[PDB]
Structure formats: structure tokens, C-alpha cells
Amino acid sequence: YMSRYEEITQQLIFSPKTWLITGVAGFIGSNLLEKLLKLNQVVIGLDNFSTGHQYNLDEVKTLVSTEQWSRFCFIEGDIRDLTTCEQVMKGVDHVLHQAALGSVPRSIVDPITTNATNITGFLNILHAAKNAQVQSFTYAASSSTYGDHPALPKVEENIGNPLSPYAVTKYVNEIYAQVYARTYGFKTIGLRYFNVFGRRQDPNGAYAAVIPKWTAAMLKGDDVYINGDGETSRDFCYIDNVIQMNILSALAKDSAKDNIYNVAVGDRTTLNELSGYIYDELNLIHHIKYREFRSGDVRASQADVTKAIDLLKYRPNIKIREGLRLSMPWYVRFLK
Amino acid sequence: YMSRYEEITQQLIFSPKTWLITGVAGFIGSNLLEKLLKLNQVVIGLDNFSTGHQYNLDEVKTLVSTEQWSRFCFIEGDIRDLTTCEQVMKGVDHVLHQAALGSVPRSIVDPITTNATNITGFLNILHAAKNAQVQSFTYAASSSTYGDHPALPKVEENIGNPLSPYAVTKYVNEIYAQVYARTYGFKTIGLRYFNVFGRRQDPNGAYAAVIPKWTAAMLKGDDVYINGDGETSRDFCYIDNVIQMNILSALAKDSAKDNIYNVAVGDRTTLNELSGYIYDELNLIHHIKYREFRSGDVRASQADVTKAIDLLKYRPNIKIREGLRLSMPWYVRFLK
Ligand SMILES: NC(=O)c1ccc[n+]([C@@H]2O[C@H](COP(=O)([O-])OP(=O)(O)OC[C@H]3O[C@@H](n4cnc5c(N)ncnc54)[C@H](O)[C@@H]3O)[C@@H](O)[C@H]2O)c1
Ligand SMILES: NC(=O)c1ccc[n+]([C@@H]2O[C@H](COP(=O)([O-])OP(=O)(O)OC[C@H]3O[C@@H](n4cnc5c(N)ncnc54)[C@H](O)[C@@H]3O)[C@@H](O)[C@H]2O)c1
Ligand SMILES: CC(=O)N[C@H]1[C@@H](OP(=O)(O)OP(=O)(O)OC[C@H]2O[C@@H](n3ccc(=O)[nH]c3=O)[C@H](O)[C@@H]2O)O[C@H](CO)[C@H](O)[C@@H]1O
Ligand SMILES: CC(=O)N[C@H]1[C@@H](OP(=O)(O)OP(=O)(O)OC[C@H]2O[C@@H](n3ccc(=O)[nH]c3=O)[C@H](O)[C@@H]2O)O[C@H](CO)[C@H](O)[C@@H]1O
The missing domain is CATH 3.90.25.10 (UDP-galactose 4-epimerase, domain 1)
Incomplete structure (x- = not known):
């Protein structure tokens, strides 16, 4: 069993909160949506169906009751538009920011589009959340951030030079997150998938x-x-290990925030x-x-996931x- | 005597080149404009008159011959628009990228716009230049990138945590630049003023x-x-020291490219x-x-300007x- 994780999910059921999932129509975003609605959570989703799929939402809807499904509000929209990001932040408690363009090759053929979504869009979501004063802000970071760094296993402190335009974007997320804590006191958790x-x-x-x-x-x-x-x-x-880490992150104590965690x-x-x-x-x-x-x-x-283990009480079970x-x-x- | 700078400048006059200066109506961009036209170069200028001034272009025109002025094409427009960056890239040999929103305090009050100009516009200009196979690409980076690093004097390898969104933007300009040499073999010079x-x-x-x-x-x-x-x-x-370093960087020997230089x-x-x-x-x-x-x-x-003095034969004179x-x-x- 995953026991701080099993405590928290129980707590959520008894008193549901309002979650924003960006990229809710994608792989990790639709798995998050599936778990959160099965816990009776209220869920605001934002996606532009770029790499995601309306059919991913159709599948989730077949996995939860109509009552559970009725607690999901979906906005079709784009993190590159700041207004959109401000609007979906209304009454949100916890932000799970998954919307991004993945693929190292996609970023090499087209670094411009990768930058717009992963830097502009990322900072848009982050700033809106700073301003709505949400309870938490958890975002999808990346193991690519380790770069040409040779040490093994990978430990959060030790990173290299990024190896692609995609790796640049996911690293810049961590930097923007850390400057936002320093400048505004808005304390986030980055998850290096x-x-x-x-x-x-x-x-x-x-x-x-x-x-x-x-x-x-x-x-x-x-x-x-x-x-x-x-x-x-x-x-x-x-995927379930990632679902666990996002949820442990959203409900983390303050001292475990403004931190980067390997998720693996x-x-x-x-x-x-x-x-x-x-x-x-x-x-x-x-x-x-x-x-x-x-x-x-x-x-x-x-x-090396000792840090997630010790601080967020993560259990890497599958x-x-x-x-x-x-x-x-x-x-x-x-x-x- | 700025002997190498002298010789580089004699090269330019005998064999004029086409330069793009972004940020050309601004403090550093209009000072680069003044020198380059004085060397009889062909110069394409881009500016959106955000912090820049038409009156700066007016002064330069009083400072150079009419014959020299005839070789300047001014285009009002915005580095945030890629199509504009591609257009002004046409037949360009040397790229001098000065367009940005400075000020640390401006970046704390409006991190969104600064990001657009300073990250989006920067990537836009860098990508267009790569695509147009220009001969050189020199960009304005910042001493703000040393961040919280305590060591005095500042040497290019040792930086710390950025203290402002502005410092994040200029630092990301360096990371993108190094990822371009790695990924596209496109070798840049970053100047930390x-x-x-x-x-x-x-x-x-x-x-x-x-x-x-x-x-x-x-x-x-x-x-x-x-x-x-x-x-x-x-x-x-x-300012003359900075003009010397942009010109020496633009005609740098290859092995001196893909490098960051302090410029003081x-x-x-x-x-x-x-x-x-x-x-x-x-x-x-x-x-x-x-x-x-x-x-x-x-x-x-x-x-510490040793690396410029050594690698580029920079001779600060004022x-x-x-x-x-x-x-x-x-x-x-x-x-x-
Ligand atoms: N899959 C992995 O191994 C992995 C590894 C490291 C990091 N990540 C990161 O995890 C996050 C989610 O990845 P995924 O595997 O679920 O990818 P995915 O492509 O399946 O999901 C990305 C989702 O974001 C949406 N999106 C993209 N740009 C958007 C925009 N501008 N506005 C609104 N929505 C937009 C897409 O439509 C899609 O639904 C991303 O941040 C990605 O970089 C994934
Ligand atoms: N002042 C310093 O000591 C210092 C130190 C480090 C780096 N820098 C950098 O030097 C460069 C030039 O600075 P400066 O001192 O000349 O400042 P400046 O404001 O006088 O000039 C910058 C110019 O860029 C133009 N510009 C800004 N955004 C634009 C956009 N989106 N599209 C087109 N044009 C745009 C402005 O109109 C302005 O003319 C900038 O990169 C700045 O960040 C300056
Ligand atoms: C270690 C690392 O940086 N991981 C990041 C990187 O995943 P990767 O780029 O490592 O993800 P991937 O599944 O695209 O590739 C894994 C590996 O399999 C190889 N391969 C892939 C396809 C194929 O047909 N044959 C083949 O051999 C591929 O070249 C690579 O070595 O980017 C992802 C987002 O997109 C995530 O950010 C990951 O955290
Ligand atoms: C060390 C450093 O990071 N320098 C960078 C930073 O310059 P600075 O922000 O230091 O340039 P500046 O002239 O704005 O500030 C100079 C100093 O004087 C102080 N001051 C300013 C105004 C005033 O009325 N009274 C007063 O005391 C100010 O608080 C600062 O300590 O940003 C610039 C872009 O904007 C450049 O990137 C510089 O490389």
C-alpha cells in the first residue's frame, strides 16, 4: 500500500476541493482527471486539443458515474492566452499544470511552437495562479533537465547542460517557479517526470x-x-506513480514546497x-x-527518488x- | 590603441557587410548604428519604439554622411512577430540582437511582457538567423545573470540563482544560444553587459x-x-567598450564563438x-x-574581462x- 497517499485520498473524498488540470485531455491529464473524479473532486479542465483528444475525455466519462462526471467543468482553450488562464483559476484550490508539448524531436523541428506552449503558457498559468492565490501549484517538469550530466543515479541537486530545445523549456519552468517563490513568496512543487x-x-x-x-x-x-x-x-x-506524486504534492506542507522531486x-x-x-x-x-x-x-x-520518499512520503509501488x-x-x- | 579592433574595422571598410541591429532606436542599438554606418556598412534596423525613440535615429543621421545614411533601412516592427524577424533577416551577414525590455523592476511588475519580448522575441530572432544562415549572431546578455553568486570578480563559469524575472530572461537567452550550437551547429556570441x-x-x-x-x-x-x-x-x-565588443564578436574566429563574454x-x-x-x-x-x-x-x-582580453583581443579603453x-x-x- 501507499499510505500517506491512501490517507490523503480518503481526506479528499470527505471534503472535496476544486482542482485545475491543464492538459486534462492528454495522457497524464486524463489519468489525473480519472482519479480525481473517482474521489468525487470538483475539477476544472483546460485543453486546446493540440496533442490531446476529445476521445480521452469520452473514455474517462465511461469510467465514472454521471454524478461524478457532473463535477467536471471543461474549457476548450489555450494556456498561451493569459485571460483564459485567469478565468479558469476562479475558485480553484489546487493547480496541476500538465499542458505542454512533449517530444525532443518535435522541439528540434519546431522550437518556436515548443517555446510558446512550454515557456509562455507555463508562465501564464503560474502568474495567474500566483494572482488568484491558490492553495498549491504543482507542475510537470522533466528528467531531460539532467542533460549531459553523467552521475548515476540522478539526484535533484545535480544537473547538466540541456541537450535539446524541449529540455530548455522544462528547465526554464523550474527557474521561473523558483524566482516566483523568491520574488512573490508563491511556493510551487516541480515534478521531474x-x-x-x-x-x-x-x-x-x-x-x-x-x-x-x-x-x-x-x-x-x-x-x-x-x-x-x-x-x-x-x-x-x-502512470499511477505519477498520479500519487501529483496528489502528495498538492497537499504538501509548506516546507516541502519550492522543491523539485524526481518522479520515478x-x-x-x-x-x-x-x-x-x-x-x-x-x-x-x-x-x-x-x-x-x-x-x-x-x-x-x-x-534516485530518496528525496520524494523522505519529504513527500512517496511510495514507488509499480x-x-x-x-x-x-x-x-x-x-x-x-x-x- | 585597440589594435585588433582597428584591424577588424579596416577589414569591414574594404569589404562591407550587411548587418541587422535589433533594438536600433535604443541606447546601445543607436550607438552600434552610428559606428557601423561610419564604417560604410549596409544596416537593416528593427525597432518598435517601446523604449526606443525616433529622435535617436534622428541624431545618428546628423552624425554620418548622407552617403552613409543611404545604406540604412529602418523597419518599425516587433521581434515578437516571427514573420517580421524572418523578413529583416533577408541577405543579413551579421546579427547584433539588442532588442529587449530592460529594467529589473519592470520585470517584477510585469513578468509577462518581459518574457514575451525577452524570451519569445529572442528565440524568434535567433531562429530566423539560423534559418537564414547568417555569418554571425551576437546578442545582449546581462551581468544580472551572476545572481546571488558571492565571488568577486565575476567570471563567466560561476553564476548563481537569478534574483529577478529579468535575469531569468537573459540567462534563458544564453541557454537557448548554447542549445542552438549543440543542435544546429549555429555558433553565437553572448555578451553579459x-x-x-x-x-x-x-x-x-x-x-x-x-x-x-x-x-x-x-x-x-x-x-x-x-x-x-x-x-x-x-x-x-x-558605450564605446560595448561597440568594440559587438564588432570583435561579430568577426570572432570560429573557436571563439559559442561563448559568453563579460563586457565591462x-x-x-x-x-x-x-x-x-x-x-x-x-x-x-x-x-x-x-x-x-x-x-x-x-x-x-x-x-573579470580576462576571457575577452584573451579570446577576442578586447582592449577596454574608457x-x-x-x-x-x-x-x-x-x-x-x-x-x-
Ligand atoms: N510522458 C512523459 O514521459 C513525460 C515525461 C516528462 C515530462 N512530461 C510532461 O508531462 C506533461 C504532460 O505530458 P503527457 O505525456 O500527458 O502529454 P500529452 O501530449 O498526452 O498531453 C499534453 C496535453 O496538453 C495539451 N496542450 C498542449 N499545449 C497546450 C496549450 N498551449 N493549451 C492548452 N493545452 C495544451 C495537449 O492538448 C495535451 O492534452 C507535459 O508537461 C510533458 O512535458 C511527460
Ligand atoms: N543597460 C545595460 O547596462 C544593459 C546590461 C545588460 C544587458 N542589457 C541589454 O542591452 C540591450 C539593449 O539595451 P539598451 O540599454 O539599449 O536599452 P534601450 O531600452 O535603450 O534599448 C532597447 C531597444 O529595444 C527595442 N525593443 C524592445 N522591445 C522590442 C520589441 N518587442 N520589438 C522591437 N524592438 C524592441 C526598444 O524600443 C529599444 O529601442 C537589451 O538587451 C538589454 O536588456 C543592457
Ligand atoms: C530521459 C529523458 O530525457 N526523458 C524525457 C524525454 O523522453 P525520451 O525522449 O527519452 O522519450 P521517448 O520515449 O521518445 O524515447 C526513449 C528512447 O527510446 C528511443 N526510441 C524511441 C522511438 C523509437 O522508435 N526507437 C527508439 O529507440 C529514443 O531515441 C530514446 O532513446 O522526453 C519526455 C517528453 O517527451 C519526458 O520529458 C522524459 O522525462
Ligand atoms: C549588476 C546588474 O544586475 N546589472 C544589470 C542591471 O542593472 P541595474 O538594475 O543595477 O541598473 P540601474 O542603473 O537601474 O541600477 C543601478 C543601481 O543604482 C540604484 N539606484 C537606481 C536608481 C536610483 O534612483 N537610485 C539608486 O540608488 C539601483 O537600486 C541599483 O542598485 O539590469 C540591467 C538591465 O536593466 C543590465 O542587465 C545590467 O547588466
Whole structure:
């Protein structure tokens, strides 16, 4: 069990608060929405359906009662517009800021669009929240922020030079957050996600992350490409661990705020092994090419999550094999 | 003698190039305009007359030949618009990016707009230049990036935490720049100015810099305010030194690109001493109160300019007293 997490969720049910989820129509945002409505929370969602999907909201609506669903207010809109951000902040207690453009390659082909959404939009949401004086502000940061820094495992204090325009944006979020605390006293929590996966992670289009991409390729019978030697490694973190950290963060005591936390499992998996993992799990459910390293790619990534453990009482409970067993049926269904 | 600068300038005159100056109606941009046209360069100018002035363009036109002036194309427009940045990039060899909203206090009261001009506009200009395959790209960075770092003097590798949104913006300009060399092989020079002063630094405005502010204050018999105990200390940099460094950076040897340079004189003057220096200097042309420290003001600032002296053959020629001597009659002219 996850017990400070199980305490808090109980508390939420007994006295529901008002949550803003930006990027509510995406992977992590729709999983947050699914958990929060199942706890009877009031939830304001904001999304421009850029990379998200109206069908992600349709699926969540099939997972909760009509009464629970009636507590969700959705605004179609864009974090780049400050007014929009001020409007959705009205009466919000806790901010979970997930809206961003992901993908390192997307950011290399088009750094401008990546900047607008991840810096302008990020600062817009942050400033509006500062001004509405919400109770908490938790935002999606990134393991890419570790950069060319070689030390292993990854510890919050120790970062490198960013390796791509995407990594620049997610780092700038931490800097803006820390200057906002210093200048205004508005104390936030940044969450350095490491390679999140699970249900509703988009398998389509050029920018799919490796798990839904390879899972889909193997189901279709498409080539599976490993960019590089395949010893590149990641801390693959199943969605429920991320859902836990967001909620622990929103209800954190003040002293644990103005802090950055690695969100992961402490494990290390190469693309070669992963490929074995995806194939094996899929196969119990029933039904490869090497090429160049990808540009601006981080080489080795393994979180040290002692800090989240000690300070937020995080329990990292689902590891990659189990996470994948939980994920694959959603994929098989979704794709056929 | 500024021997390398001399030789670089003889190169330009025999083989004129096309330059873009953003921020060209402003203090530093109009001073770069003056020199470059004096070298018979072709110059494209961009400005939105936010902090800049048409009267600065009017003065430059009195200072250069008609033949020289004919090679200046002024375009009013805004670096926040990409299409505009792409347009003025056409046939550009050397990029001098000065357009931004300065002032630390302005960034604390309006972090949104500063971000747009100073992060969005900066990325817009940098991306257009990469795309147009210009020969060089030199941009205005800031000594405010040293932040809370205690060590004196300031050397480029050692910075601390930014104290203002403004410092965040200039620091992000450096990170984007280094990510462009890494990702696109597009090599930039970032210049961290330390408190530049000279002809055409604006004395009017709630955000006027200390030297034009105090000069105007003293001439009107108005109150001179010290924000602090007066022991706040700076490396005050007369404008010609900055002009020398932009020109040396634009024709830098390749190995000296993808680098950040302090741009000062290496001296240290407290606010208490400056007030006496201005007064004495003014007093030869014949005509204090303490309040609170200013929020997120850097305490103490002295540049180590060894890396410029070494890598670029920068030769700073004008220190504070002489630079005040040269500037004082400009201000008497302006305000009369
Ligand atoms: N998936 C991961 O491994 C991972 C890793 C590190 C960081 N992150 C970060 O997690 C956050 C969410 O990622 P995700 O995996 O859920 O991606 P996603 O693309 O599935 O979700 C992003 C959501 O934000 C929305 N969005 C984008 N720009 C917007 C804008 N300008 N206005 C309003 N909505 C906008 C998209 O429509 C989408 O619904 C992002 O901040 C991302 O950088 C994810
Ligand atoms: N004053 C200093 O000592 C110092 C120190 C470090 C960095 N800098 C930087 O030096 C550069 C120039 O500063 P300055 O002292 O010349 O200030 P300034 O305000 O006199 O000049 C800046 C110019 O940029 C123009 N501008 C601003 N935003 C624009 C936009 N969106 N579109 C088009 N034009 C725009 C303004 O109209 C102005 O003419 C800036 O990057 C500033 O941040 C200055
Ligand atoms: C360690 C790190 O920086 N992680 C960040 C980075 O994820 P990654 O860029 O690491 O996410 P990803 O799933 O896109 O790639 C993982 C790895 O698998 C490789 N690959 C991918 C597809 C393929 O067909 N074949 C293949 O080999 C890819 O080159 C990379 O080495 O960006 C994400 C947002 O987008 C998150 O911010 C992550 O925190
Ligand atoms: C050390 C530092 O970070 N310098 C940067 C900072 O300059 P500064 O903000 O230091 O420039 P400034 O002239 O505005 O301020 C100079 C100093 O004088 C003080 N003061 C100012 C006005 C007054 O009426 N009385 C008074 O005492 C002020 O509080 C500060 O301590 O920002 C600039 C852009 O805006 C440049 O980036 C400089 O590189």
C-alpha cells in the first residue's frame, strides 16, 4: 500500500476541493482527471486539443458515474492566452499544470511552437495562479533537465547542460517557479517526470513515445526501430506513480514546497530489454531494426527518488513489468 | 590603441557587410548604428519604439554622411512577430540582437511582457538567423545573470540563482544560444553587459538607469535618491567598450564563438562614489537622500574581462571618470 497517499485520498473524498488540470485531455491529464473524479473532486479542465483528444475525455466519462462526471467543468482553450488562464483559476484550490508539448524531436523541428506552449503558457498559468492565490501549484517538469550530466543515479541537486530545445523549456519552468517563490513568496512543487507510460499515452503520429509506439508497431506488424545501440536506458515510470506524486504534492506542507522531486521508480532499463518486455507481455495477451542514435537524446537515466520518499512520503509501488502487464490490454483494445 | 579592433574595422571598410541591429532606436542599438554606418556598412534596423525613440535615429543621421545614411533601412516592427524577424533577416551577414525590455523592476511588475519580448522575441530572432544562415549572431546578455553568486570578480563559469524575472530572461537567452550550437551547429556570441552608460541612454521614464537619472536629477536641482546604504557597487561600462565588443564578436574566429563574454572594464564603483563623480563632472559645466534597497537588486558587481582580453583581443579603453566626461555635455545638450 501507499499510505500517506491512501490517507490523503480518503481526506479528499470527505471534503472535496476544486482542482485545475491543464492538459486534462492528454495522457497524464486524463489519468489525473480519472482519479480525481473517482474521489468525487470538483475539477476544472483546460485543453486546446493540440496533442490531446476529445476521445480521452469520452473514455474517462465511461469510467465514472454521471454524478461524478457532473463535477467536471471543461474549457476548450489555450494556456498561451493569459485571460483564459485567469478565468479558469476562479475558485480553484489546487493547480496541476500538465499542458505542454512533449517530444525532443518535435522541439528540434519546431522550437518556436515548443517555446510558446512550454515557456509562455507555463508562465501564464503560474502568474495567474500566483494572482488568484491558490492553495498549491504543482507542475510537470522533466528528467531531460539532467542533460549531459553523467552521475548515476540522478539526484535533484545535480544537473547538466540541456541537450535539446524541449529540455530548455522544462528547465526554464523550474527557474521561473523558483524566482516566483523568491520574488512573490508563491511556493510551487516541480515534478521531474522520467518516461511516464500507461493507458491513454498516445500511440499515433510521428511523436509517439517509445512504449505506445513499439506496442503499436508489434500489433500492426510494423518495423521496430532501436535508435542507436539499444543500451540507452530509462527509468520507466507507470502512470499511477505519477498520479500519487501529483496528489502528495498538492497537499504538501509548506516546507516541502519550492522543491523539485524526481518522479520515478529508481530502476534502469535499456531499449533492448524493453523490447523483450513489450514482446513478452503482448504475447501472453496474444498475437526489429537498429538505426542511428536520435539527436539531443539523453544517454543513461535512472532516478534516485530518496528525496520524494523522505519529504513527500512517496511510495514507488509499480515497476515496469507490472506496469506493462497493466497497460497492454488497453493498447490491444484501443488499436483494433 | 585597440589594435585588433582597428584591424577588424579596416577589414569591414574594404569589404562591407550587411548587418541587422535589433533594438536600433535604443541606447546601445543607436550607438552600434552610428559606428557601423561610419564604417560604410549596409544596416537593416528593427525597432518598435517601446523604449526606443525616433529622435535617436534622428541624431545618428546628423552624425554620418548622407552617403552613409543611404545604406540604412529602418523597419518599425516587433521581434515578437516571427514573420517580421524572418523578413529583416533577408541577405543579413551579421546579427547584433539588442532588442529587449530592460529594467529589473519592470520585470517584477510585469513578468509577462518581459518574457514575451525577452524570451519569445529572442528565440524568434535567433531562429530566423539560423534559418537564414547568417555569418554571425551576437546578442545582449546581462551581468544580472551572476545572481546571488558571492565571488568577486565575476567570471563567466560561476553564476548563481537569478534574483529577478529579468535575469531569468537573459540567462534563458544564453541557454537557448548554447542549445542552438549543440543542435544546429549555429555558433553565437553572448555578451553579459555590466551597466553600460553613454550618449543616448534615456534619462526620462520611471525605469531610467542610475547615471542618466542622477545627471538629470542634478541638473534640475531635484532630489537624488540612493536605493540602499549606497554601498551597492557596479562595473560601469562606457558605450564605446560595448561597440568594440559587438564588432570583435561579430568577426570572432570560429573557436571563439559559442561563448559568453563579460563586457565591462573590471573596475568597481559604489553608488556613494558615483554620486560624487557625476556631480564633480557636471560641476565643470556648472548649474542626496537614502531610501530602501531595490527588490532583487544584485549587491556588488565587478567584472573579470580576462576571457575577452584573451579570446577576442578586447582592449577596454574608457573607464568611468573619462566616460562621464564624454557623456556629460550630451546630457546638457539633451535636457536644455
Ligand atoms: N510522458 C512523459 O514521459 C513525460 C515525461 C516528462 C515530462 N512530461 C510532461 O508531462 C506533461 C504532460 O505530458 P503527457 O505525456 O500527458 O502529454 P500529452 O501530449 O498526452 O498531453 C499534453 C496535453 O496538453 C495539451 N496542450 C498542449 N499545449 C497546450 C496549450 N498551449 N493549451 C492548452 N493545452 C495544451 C495537449 O492538448 C495535451 O492534452 C507535459 O508537461 C510533458 O512535458 C511527460
Ligand atoms: N543597460 C545595460 O547596462 C544593459 C546590461 C545588460 C544587458 N542589457 C541589454 O542591452 C540591450 C539593449 O539595451 P539598451 O540599454 O539599449 O536599452 P534601450 O531600452 O535603450 O534599448 C532597447 C531597444 O529595444 C527595442 N525593443 C524592445 N522591445 C522590442 C520589441 N518587442 N520589438 C522591437 N524592438 C524592441 C526598444 O524600443 C529599444 O529601442 C537589451 O538587451 C538589454 O536588456 C543592457
Ligand atoms: C530521459 C529523458 O530525457 N526523458 C524525457 C524525454 O523522453 P525520451 O525522449 O527519452 O522519450 P521517448 O520515449 O521518445 O524515447 C526513449 C528512447 O527510446 C528511443 N526510441 C524511441 C522511438 C523509437 O522508435 N526507437 C527508439 O529507440 C529514443 O531515441 C530514446 O532513446 O522526453 C519526455 C517528453 O517527451 C519526458 O520529458 C522524459 O522525462
Ligand atoms: C549588476 C546588474 O544586475 N546589472 C544589470 C542591471 O542593472 P541595474 O538594475 O543595477 O541598473 P540601474 O542603473 O537601474 O541600477 C543601478 C543601481 O543604482 C540604484 N539606484 C537606481 C536608481 C536610483 O534612483 N537610485 C539608486 O540608488 C539601483 O537600486 C541599483 O542598485 O539590469 C540591467 C538591465 O536593466 C543590465 O542587465 C545590467 O547588466
